Design a protein around this ligand. Structure first.
Ligand code: 1EY
Length: 140
């Protein structure tokens, strides 16, 4: 549902300022986060990809081979309201995106591609929250 996806979004973005400081990222990535869930908005900046990668790593969502860690993704989803079914459905969407995306040597671009594919799948399910919820109050 959009309500669960809002909560997952807020919690995924809570480390954004921490990741920006660790990576010395520029403020020109901020608008991409404010617009993350805006339908048809494409993020193209690889630096925003690096940030998304870091946010995933903060939640232990990347396994030792650079692919989704299903168990930790499931645990994250379920803490914030997903039942086992929704958790599985979310993980399957991300896995499906990993397998469909044009492959990329650059992890920041790979992550970006997976995020954009995932976003489109969530819109297709009518589960997208408001556009700006990943940021929450983290940049205020
Ligand atoms: C688990 C996500 C649920 C709600 C909102 C945002 C999640 C961020 C979507 C990006 C997915 C990152 C997967 C690629 C990680 C690099 O291997």
């Amino acid at each position: 549902s959009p309500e669960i996806m809002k909560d997952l979004s807020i919690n995924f973005g809570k480390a954004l300022d921490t990741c920006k400081k660790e990576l010395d990222l520029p403020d020109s990535i901020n608008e991409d986060f404010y617009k993350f869930w805006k339908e048809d908005y494409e993020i193209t900046n690889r630096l925003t990809g690096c940030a998304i990668k870091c946010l995933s790593e903060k939640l232990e969502m990347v396994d030792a081979d650079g692919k989704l860690h299903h168990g930790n993704a499931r645990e994250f989803a379920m803490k914030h309201g997903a039942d086992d079914a929704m958790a599985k459905q979310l993980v399957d969407l991300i896995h499906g995106c990993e397998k469909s995306i044009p492959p990329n040597d650059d992890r920041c671009m790979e992550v970006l591609s997976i995020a954009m594919c995932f976003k489109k799948e969530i819109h297709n399910l009518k589960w997208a929250p408001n556009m700006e919820v990943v940021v929450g109050e983290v940049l205020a």
